[PDB]
Design a protein around this ligand. Structure first.
Ligand SMILES: O=P(O)(O)OP(=O)(O)OC[C@H]1O[C@@H](n2cnc3c(NCc4ccccc4)ncnc32)[C@H](O)[C@@H]1O
Length: 450
């Protein structure tokens, strides 16, 4: 019945409970969602703890080299990290077959370079596990530990577990949502948006958080609080998580600190100098993927653009500032006008009829796509805002960009089809981008290579 600490965890409040990886915890009250009241067996202290920080004793989730339900694409992301010596591996669930697992390993080919081989693990009726018929085990752990000593036909011996970062605790603490202003100390100014400022800071003198400040009058607090309610329900691997908020003006928005900055910025300068088509595409698919969930959630971003796409380690992309624009009270902006409204990204029907839907966002993504293929080049190069709606209204569209493959320009076009619902879905854009270069995310090794 005991739980085991997958990671360490510092005490943030007067009411939570610190611990070390490996530390056993009695889950003495599971009657919550993201924070469990627990009691430490070693120390014996009692307090709240972040659920995604533990797993059951003897469970598979207890295993540090088990990644759960991650996509092959994602793990490959992780594994391919340069610092990872050959043989860095992980064990996740196969998506192709329900129940089966997959052992992914980094390898190096003198003639192919670094890469990751995948080996499906089949579990027999018996209950056995095995990659190859001539060697099965009773637990993934016996399998793993085995290949940890002997390669045995695998592309290489499983040297090192795949290193990952402490994950995000949903929220700063239990019930924590509308936190006192004084609990945030703004440290570093990170950017100056049109309606506010964004700072790297600390909540309760322990946590690394990102805070957004909004100039007063910007938006109705009550409305904000209401919208925040909705936002707060959107959890996605490719969406910048929301943590807590300061409702009274100057309203504050406290979320995940993304080191690598805005994808726009990053796209230009040296950061995006050795950026190749294959990497750009990936960023796009990550974005699609995020937008895909907004779509399934039946939500609307209303301000999608490179500038609202943040970067993370391993070239990870997360969508930000979703919603907020719909709360902007600035007159001109409400009328989709003025020097502060991102018109060049706005779908016509949205500029003209304020009809903001997912389909308008698909338009936006289209533009964003060109940003990707042109190192953050402001779109509609030869047009000042004022004449853009006009032009696009009449059917004008940015031609295929320099060095952008036509297929991507055609994607773009599909995103700009005058008819909102002729424009493709994110679920689609996600699939399309996810397999450009003859790689449908399939192909696992056979068995004994030797
Ligand atoms: O809308 P624009 O003007 O592009 O500018 P902002 O609304 O400030 O957002 C993007 C700019 O601010 C910085 N920035 C924004 N967010 C972050 C961030 N974490 C996400 C987050 C922060 C605050 C509240 C919830 C989530 N980590 C690091 N830098 C960030 C960027 O460098 C960019 O210049």
């Amino acid at each position: 019945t005991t739980f085991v600490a997958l990671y360490d965890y510092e005490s943030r409040t007067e009411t939570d409970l610190s611990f070390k990886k490996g530390e056993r915890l009695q889950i003495v009250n599971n009657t919550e969602g993201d924070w469990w009241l627990a009691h430490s067996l070693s120390t014996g202290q009692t307090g709240y703890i972040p659920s995604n920080y533990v797993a059951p004793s003897d469970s598979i989730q207890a295993e540090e080299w088990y990644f759960g339900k991650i996509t092959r694409r994602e793990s490959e992301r992780l594994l391919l990290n340069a610092e990872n010596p050959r043989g860095t591996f992980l064990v996740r669930e196969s998506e192709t077959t329900k129940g089966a697992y997959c052992l992914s390993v980094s390898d190096f080919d003198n003639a192919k370079g670094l890469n990751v081989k995948h080996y499906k693990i089949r579990k027999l009726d018996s209950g056995g596990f095995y990659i190859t018929s001539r060697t099965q085990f009773n637990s993934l752990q016996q399998l793993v530990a085995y290949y940890s000593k002997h390669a045995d036909g695998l592309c290489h011996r499983l040297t090192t577990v795949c290193p990952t970062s402490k994950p995000q605790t949903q929220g700063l603490a239990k019930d924590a949502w509308e936190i006192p202003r004084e609990s945030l100390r703004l440290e570093v100014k990170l950017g100056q948006g049109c309606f506010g400022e964004v700072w790297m800071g600390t909540w309760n003198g322990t946590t690394r958080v990102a805070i957004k400040t909004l100039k007063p009058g910007t938006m109705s607090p009550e409305a904000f609080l209401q919208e925040a309610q909705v936002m707060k329900k959107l959890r996605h691997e490719k969406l910048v998580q929301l943590y807590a908020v300061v409702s009274e003006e100057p309203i504050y928005i406290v979320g995940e600190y993304m080191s690598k900055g805005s994808l726009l910025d990053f796209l230009k300068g040296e950061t995006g100098k050795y950026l190749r088509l294959p990497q750009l595409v990936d960023m796009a698919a990550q974005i699609a993927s995020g937008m895909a969930y907004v779509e399934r959630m039946n939500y609307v971003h209303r301000d999608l653009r490179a500038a609202n796409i943040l970067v993370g380690e391993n070239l990870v992309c997360k969508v930000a500032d979703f919603g907020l624009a719909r709360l902007i009270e600035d007159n001109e902006y409400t009328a989709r006008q003025g020097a502060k409204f991102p018109i060049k990204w706005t779908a016509p029907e949205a500029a003209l009829y304020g009809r903001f839907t997912i389909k308008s966002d698909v338009w936006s993504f289209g533009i964003l796509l060109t940003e990707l293929t042109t190192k953050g080049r402001v779109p509609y190069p030869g047009m000042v805002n004022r004449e853009v709606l006009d032009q696009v209204e009449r059917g004008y569209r940015m031609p295929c960009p320099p060095e952008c493959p036509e297929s991507l320009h055609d994607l773009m076009c599909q995103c700009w089809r005058k008819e909102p619902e002729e424009r493709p879905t994110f679920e689609y854009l996600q699939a399309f981008l996810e397999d450009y270069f003859t790689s449908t995310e399939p192909q696992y090794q056979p068995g004994e290579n030797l």
